[PDB]
Design a protein around this ligand. Structure first.
Ligand SMILES: [Cl-]
Ligand SMILES: [Cl-]
Ligand SMILES: [Cl-]
Lengths: 369, 369, 369
């Protein structure tokens, strides 16, 4: 039929757009379906910026984690007393708290910058706004909302200087071209206290799962990553090779919003739903760059890569999650069922079952076909 | 009138049933009443299985705690890399995480098995499904939802072997008869790492409250029981003797779903509700085996046993809960009011009040009448 | 137009009232607006009692923090096994758990007592009831909801003694006049274990922010204040001098319900809202004694005092909150933006911007005008 778990990149709507770039926000997941109530406070944003461009300073009333999907950026985060600028490469993530100003430079000369954000609103479930201190074609300065006298006392200056220096619309919108020299100066302080936390490499150590057909890196809510711990969340980076298949599996407790960063493939997701009688229903999707889908906890999925597929996953309800497989040797929960219980449940004997299950001696990722 | 806090066992609906057993699920508590919004993510399940039967392997997209209400079971829990089987007797509880496969054997020869489950959905508030890897009359294997080619690559075998060994409906449903010998072999590994946590005896130590008329055991969210701590929940086992009355009391912060495992009795629950004017309303219930009722925090209740009454309680919002009484010597909050404040609030003097309150020198449970 | 963030004290409704005092409860914040869903479980109560009066014993099915806005009280908290009485002065807060009985004496001879409460319901989001063990004109004893036989067994006495001593309506309502001598005796045990936690002085140490124009004390969720830690909440006390202006600022993650305890002023709050196009909208309010308003996270606000203004703030989502300013020297996030990024976003050069920003060498609070 159709698939509530699949949001093609056409379901994103641009919030700000121009020659320089565009910030698109995926619709609220519970506008879709009541199945995604638990996911309503998580909005996905994708930013694309051209070379030598900057997304201008803003803060949001939402807690953010930002990931570089493609290219090189310098991201700067500021609070009331401090600032930190980080050179980020693809696969590096950075948390940006609510109310902290940030801006994003595309460091690269010829490559576009693609960035994925998960945004967690603080005031109203599933809704947030960006607050820009400068004016532009797309939006006014929030300082304009203050009265003339309030502004005059605040800055200790007349309304005329303030407006001309700060308030005026200055036009190309919220993503702007930057000179070669200016990019040099914006990058000067960059790194390759105060809740301004350092970036993390999603691919930092060994992958949890690795074979000739596929790779899975994961950062868990850990003593190692207290921020993830505070948010009960994990960050996952999957690489499936062209012609490979990630075996049927599921996450035991985590719900995962998956973004497709590069490549093409085919999603299989199995659910149990009410017609009283409960039926297995299969859901499929032709995955493409920019797409998003939702992997609910405990629901089987398998993914087939028609080209090299790169998937970034934001997990919710992460703590103690187990990614459990249904085939192959490693992490195979069916293997773990007692023989005698295999005999009673399946049509084959326990011996047949165990024999058939051991046919597949590879784990996790295999050759499609 | 009628009672929103009381769910007679007729309000359970069978999800799977047969000669062997039946799994009944109590309706969603907020389908009832908006008073139970805080309880919407908790569904109660009761399983009854006959001797020498097994509930077949399944996982659910819900976090579970299971309690033995009557009889002897062997419960096995499995994840991707591990398995543990436990002989459980009445009063023993076991947590089964989301996405972990389990199955339930009735160890006993002639006695039925009664099991109570509280299920906490992960994907959609108040709704969950069971996922069976084998097919049957009642439900299909979720492997059927995968494509032929996906299955063939996964198991490294043709569709024909897979379907015949695994996929085929093999019929008597999800609870099956088991041979005397097979029960021996399923019990072989049983006990009388990996988030597979051991069972707990609800009645393990001394009871918190004990007297000739009644008993109350409780397991609290504790350093001793970190799982309970993580879930902010407690598990309570009450025994009220025939002809006894549990004194008017309430839990200070916890909301408790109470299941009646054995016996008969009479529930009194007092609420304050809006007609502006606030009025005391009394709610009553003839308690019987299988019944469920809801004890909201801070609402007075008293229970009268017409036969020996056994009650199992699942507490939510447990941490720092106080079960506070309104009569008797122990835990009597009215006693604790200053004399002078007693004098000002009640019609009697402070002296009379204190005199009348000390008439009852027993605590918690007394003789009804 | 009109202002959803502003609740004038006329929006409070009295729940109990009389010559002695009145308890008014502010309406549910989400009856207002869907913007305040995250604030639905927080109800504000204001109590005013005349000299030598007592609010009678009650418990609620809500967790409470109580603050003295004006005057002197003795507040007593009781559970099943213990009692503690505290002399509270203005600026002192006290937590009262759900289900714990409390009562409030106005210690003072000629001064009225004003008390602010934030109430966090436990059973049903945004709704709670008070449970009085004594009867009165305004409400019945909850003991009346128990049957005659239940009561007789409980207290070990006949229905006649019980009713006359305890049950009878004894009339002036829930706030009562108290003799000079009785106030002496109710104060005897007062202080100037068991989850009965001591009061805290909101103004206890140094203020976080201090200058000739203004003061801000804050108690944070801290190892120092584990209760606040458990609730993820902070308590804030602001003093703005007559003719002063608190500079444009916002809280990075916290949402704050602010109560006006004394004085008059003018609130400016800036939001971003949808007309697609996002626009700055300004919201204003003439603040007066008793008023409440809501400061959502990340939304700019400035406050102007026309007389000496005292504001008490209940923060939600507190942990790691940053109160960030937009002008002045201290805590100015705009200062923190890189010069080159200032140059690109604002109309003025980076130099002008930085020059104009340094015009204001005071921090936080300045002279209005
Ligand atoms: Cl996955
Ligand atoms: Cl109880
Ligand atoms: Cl503030």
């Amino acid at each position: 039929r159709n698939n509530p778990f699949y949001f093609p990149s056409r379901r994103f709507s641009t919030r700000y757009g121009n020659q320089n770039g565009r910030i698109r926000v995926l619709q609220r997941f519970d506008q879709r379906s009541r199945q995604f109530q638990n996911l309503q406070n998580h909005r996905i944003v994708q930013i694309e910026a051209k070379p030598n461009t900057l997304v201008l300073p803003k803060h949001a009333d939402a807690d953010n984690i930002l990931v570089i999907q493609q290219g090189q950026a310098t991201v700067t985060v500021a609070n009331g007393n401090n600032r930190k600028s980080f050179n980020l490469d693809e696969g590096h993530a950075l948390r940006i708290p609510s109310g902290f100003i940030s801006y994003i430079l595309n460091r690269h000369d010829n490559q576009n910058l693609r960035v994925a954000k998960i945004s967690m609103p603080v005031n109203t479930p599933g809704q947030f706004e960006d607050f820009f201190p400068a004016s532009s074609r797309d939006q006014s300065s929030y300082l304009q909302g203050f009265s003339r006298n309030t502004l005059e006392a605040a800055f200790n200056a007349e309304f005329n200087e303030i407006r001309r220096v700060l308030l005026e619309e200055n036009n190309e919108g919220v993503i702007v071209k930057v000179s070669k020299e200016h990019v040099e100066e914006l990058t000067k302080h960059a790194k390759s206290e105060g809740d301004i936390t350092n970036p993390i490499n999603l691919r930092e150590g060994e992958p949890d799962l690795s074979n000739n057909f596929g790779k899975l890196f994961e950062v868990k809510p850990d003593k190692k990553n207290p921020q993830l711990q505070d948010l009960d969340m994990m960050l996952t980076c999957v690489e499936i090779k062209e012609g490979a298949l990630m075996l049927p599996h599921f996450n035991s407790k985590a719900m995962v919003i998956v973004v497709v960063n590069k490549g093409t493939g085919n999603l299989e997701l199995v659910a149990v739903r009410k017609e009283s009688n409960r039926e297995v229903r299969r859901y499929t999707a032709r995955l493409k760059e920019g797409d998003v889908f939702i992997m609910p906890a405990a629901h089987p999925v398998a993914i087939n890569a028609s080209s090299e597929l790169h998937l970034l996953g934001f997990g919710i309800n992460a703590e103690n999650n187990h990614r459990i497989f249904l085939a192959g040797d490693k992490d195979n929960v069916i293997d773990q069922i007692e023989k005698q219980a295999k005999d009673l449940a399946f049509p084959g004997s326990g011996e047949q079952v165990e024999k058939l299950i051991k046919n597949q001696k590879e784990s996790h990722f295999v050759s499609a076909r």
